[PDB]
Design an enzyme around this catalytic site. Structure first.
Site, PDB file in Angstrom:
ATOM      1  N   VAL M  58       0.811  -1.210   0.000  1.00 18.56           N
ATOM      2  CA  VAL M  58       0.000   0.000   0.000  1.00 18.56           C
ATOM      3  C   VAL M  58       0.852   1.272   0.000  1.00 18.56           C
ATOM      4  O   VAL M  58       0.570   2.190  -0.794  1.00 18.56           O
ATOM      5  CB  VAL M  58      -0.983   0.003   1.165  1.00 18.56           C
ATOM      6  N   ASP M  59       1.917   1.362   0.816  1.00 15.01           N
ATOM      7  CA  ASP M  59       2.875   2.464   0.898  1.00 15.01           C
ATOM      8  C   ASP M  59       3.682   2.675  -0.388  1.00 15.01           C
ATOM      9  O   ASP M  59       4.055   3.791  -0.753  1.00 15.01           O
ATOM     10  CB  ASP M  59       3.811   2.272   2.118  1.00 15.01           C
ATOM     11  N   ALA M  60       3.915   1.619  -1.180  1.00 12.61           N
ATOM     12  CA  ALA M  60       4.564   1.771  -2.463  1.00 12.61           C
ATOM     13  C   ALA M  60       3.796   2.616  -3.496  1.00 12.61           C
ATOM     14  O   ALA M  60       4.410   3.378  -4.247  1.00 12.61           O
ATOM     15  CB  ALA M  60       4.934   0.385  -3.003  1.00 12.61           C
TER      16      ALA M  60
END
Lengths: 52, 211, 69, 75, 75, 75, 75, 75, 75, 75, 52, 75, 75, 75
Positions: M58-60
């Site tokens: 998700v953070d990517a």
């Protein structure tokens, strides 16, 4: 595709389809049908023999 | 015309190749695991086939068969990653003949079954329900488009995505990454072809189920 | 610790009883905070021993066979 | 003129849209507090402090947005 | 003219979009109050004050947005 | 001209987008009222007044947005 | 020209984006009505009137947006 | 030219963004119909008419957006 | 030039943003179909037709958006 | 002038809108902490550290947005 | 700075050729002999059965 | 120049924002597949084909958005 | 000047709005981890690694947005 | 200049906003994986591959957005 080129492009696919219809569908439809009726058949004869 | 007729030729090569390998193959052999996969493919194909049940049944089997079968065609180009217009109007070729054929088969259930015999009345009280006749008329319109619309939209959609993976693979100066994605892109390709046969059986369930 | 009239029954006869202010166990749902003041609710628990603050700070782990509470 | 106009547009943009996230997020937390206490009333003094911590952390994200808004208006 | 036009556009931007967050957030809280009281009616006087606190904190985020809007319109 | 154009654009911006928050929030509350009454029918006269309070507080956030819209159109 | 162009852009902005909130909110309510009646069928004549009230209140928020849209188009 | 350009931009704005609300809202309702019928199959003829009513009310909000779009394109 | 530029911007606006509503809404419905069939497998032939109806109604809202997009691009 | 105006508009855009995601996300986490502890009070020391980790990871996404905002304002 | 694609594609083709060919091959063969040996095995044992 | 600039802005608008709807919608479906199979493992071969159908229908809405994007970039 | 102004506006746009998706998504995952561990404490060492994998994926998506932002600011 | 400025603005638009959909969607899936495994631990090797498939399909929608972004920046 300047003219008629992309046209014949799609035409090729359509043609292969029809060729599959006349010969392939008859020979191969019956062909996979043949293995189906084959294992199917032998297995069937199996069952009957045992039960009777 | 000459330009990008080459791509149409490539499409021809693949399509006809499948077409002949078919009747070649039924006689023999096919393989030790040959009989096996013959079973999984043919049989599973039949299982999903109803689905439809019986409308296209012999030509249904032959049909989705050629869908994945001939569908390996552009799947070659994804493997090419690991002139400059060999596959272009071949991808466009497949897309075009694809959506076109979709609407076509709709007509097959239309004349062959009712279907279009019933579709002459498909205006129907659905047009009155919904008092304005354009209720059923319009619904049916969006539908009839949607069969070849989603059909070809996915057809050249996949053909295109294939092309994108390809060129992406083509333009990189240190291209090991192209090798990396070529695997992913390829998986995507297989997804595309099987999903195409999936569309086929969907239209089948629709087709022998209805019309 | 005593709160809310904590009884233990079984078919042939009641298992035990008391008032337990805290009942330390993990419900069949999950970790169950030992508490007085929980709401009307239905429960069941697998076998095992649950310490409980029962009447006057008397907290004890009591093995179960599985059963409902 | 153009720089001043850009300040007033920028102040509106940064003030309003980002602050929606806590307007929603502060409410999400209080809904969890209300539902948790309704299900288990004895857990009220344990989870009320959690709700306050959590509301303040959610409210700090808009206060950042508001800070940029005020910088654009008055700095 | 350009600065005045920017004020009126900025006022519209900061007023409307951010205030959506409490329009949703005030409702989220009251839905939690209604569902919590329906599940456990005896907990009504405990959670009603929580709902009021929480609604006011959610409503303060838009009031910030509205404040910037009014500054742009009238300051 | 530029100031008048900015008023009409600003009126559209502040009127429509913020009012989405109550369109959703009024519905969230009524869904909680319906679900709470379906689960426990005897709690209807207790939670119906809560639903009205809550709907009006959610509806006030758009009425703020609409107010800015009307100021931009007519003030 | 500039004022007329601003009217047509403003009409598009206020009409479409805000009306999304009831498109969602009317649906949220009917989903609650369907789920509440499925769980407890005897509560149908009690909650159906609640659904109608609630749908109309949610639909009024877009009708406000549409009103501003029509004013911009025709007033 | 400027007025015509504004019409085409305004048509795009009002047509697409608001219609997202029913695209979601029509789906929310059918999900409630499917889940309600799966939980209690005997309630199918009671809740199917509710689903149709509710889908049509949600679909009317975009049809308003589409109406403004067509006015901008052709009126 | 200005009218042509406005067509291409308007086509992008109406095509992409509104179509998000069915991208979500088609998925909401299929999630309800999967969850309903997992909970009660015998209800599959009853709710599958409901899922198809519902998916097509949700998909029609973007097809409206796409229609306006194509009009702007090619009409 | 144009570059400076663009900096101030860009600062407003990047600061406010992205920070809404943690305003919501920090709240989502604390709601899960409150609901998890209400359901199972003995799991409090296990899940409280998870909530802190998770809040900080969600808060880092806006701090990225705020960083770009400050670069635009002061770099 | 170097072409560098076909190397990775080739090594992945080695290790993956192994993993994939391995994975599918045994199942498909056991499916072959499963099938032929199926209708077969049943038929034969059932022949012993009926005859006997 | 103005028409070319409008193409590149329009391509960005139609490509990114609409594709968010399937990014969410494809995930909604797979979450339903995972939760349905976790609750009832025997229903896996029944609902997996439903998940594939549903993912492809949700993915077609962005592919429409992407199609308009590519037309704007290259047509 | 115009190209430099466009870089700073573009940096604000790509940095802030897309990063909201992980601000929400990282929180969604940690809420699932907390709720899953509260319901079944013995499953903690199995699902904690899943939460880390999922948070990083998700953070990517924002880190992609941030990458484009930094390219626009400094490349 | 105008075409180059449009490229940089378009790159910001298509990169950031669409990628929010997977930032959310990748997280939705992992939350379903965590909740499904917490409810039924024996189903872990069945649903983990589903989660990977589903995450990659959701991540492909932003990668499309990112692709358009990079085309605008570098093509």
């Amino acid at each position: 595709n300047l003219n008629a080129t992309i046209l014949g492009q799609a035409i090729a696919f359509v043609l292969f389809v029809l060729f599959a219809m006349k010969y392939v569908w008859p020979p191969l439809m019956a062909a996979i049908e043949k293995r189906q009726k084959e294992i199917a058949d032998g297995l069937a004869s199996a069952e009957r023999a045992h039960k009777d | 015309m000459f330009f990008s007729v080459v791509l149409g030729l490539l499409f021809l090569v693949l399509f006809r190749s499948v077409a002949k390998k078919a009747t070649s193959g039924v006689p023999g052999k096919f393989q030790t695991a040959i009989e096996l996969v013959i079973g999984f493919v043919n049989g599973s194909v039949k299982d999903m086939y109803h689905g439809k049940s019986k409308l296209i049944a012999p030509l249904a089997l032959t049909i989705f068969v050629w869908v994945f079968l001939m569908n390996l065609m552009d799947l070659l180009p994804i493997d090419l990653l690991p002139r400059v217009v060999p596959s272009a109007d071949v991808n466009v070729t497949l897309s075009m003949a694809l959506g076109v054929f979709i609407l076509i088969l709709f007509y097959s259930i239309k004349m062959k079954g009712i279907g279009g015999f019933t579709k002459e009345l498909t205006l129907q009280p659905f047009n009155h329900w919904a008092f304005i006749p354009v209720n059923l008329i319009l619904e049916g319109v969006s539908l009839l488009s949607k069969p070849v619309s989603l059909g070809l939209r996915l057809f050249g959609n996949m053909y295109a995505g294939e092309l994108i993976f390809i060129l992406i693979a083509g333009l990189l100066p240190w291209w090991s990454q192209w090798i990396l994605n070529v695997p992913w892109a390829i998986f995507h390709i297989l997804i595309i072809t099987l999903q195409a046969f999936i569309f086929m059986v969907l239209t089948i369930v629709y087709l022998s189920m209805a019309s | 610790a005593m709160t809310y009239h904590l009884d233990v029954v079984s078919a042939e006869q009641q298992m035990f009883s008391g008032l337990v202010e805290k009942i330390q166990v993990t419900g069949s749902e999950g970790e169950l905070g030992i508490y007085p003041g929980h709401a009307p609710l239905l429960t069941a628990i697998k076998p095992g021993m649950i310490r409980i603050v029962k009447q006057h700070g008397h907290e004890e782990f009591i093995y179960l066979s599985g059963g409902i509470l | 003129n153009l720089n001043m106009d850009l300040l007033y547009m920028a102040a509106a943009v940064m003030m309003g849209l980002a602050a929606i996230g806590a307007a929603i997020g502060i409410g999400i937390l209080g809904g969890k507090f209300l539902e948790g206490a309704a299900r288990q009333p004895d857990l009220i003094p344990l989870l009320r402090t959690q709700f306050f911590i959590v509301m303040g952390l959610v409210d700090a994200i808009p206060m950042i947005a508001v800070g940029l808004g005020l910088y654009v208006m008055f700095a």
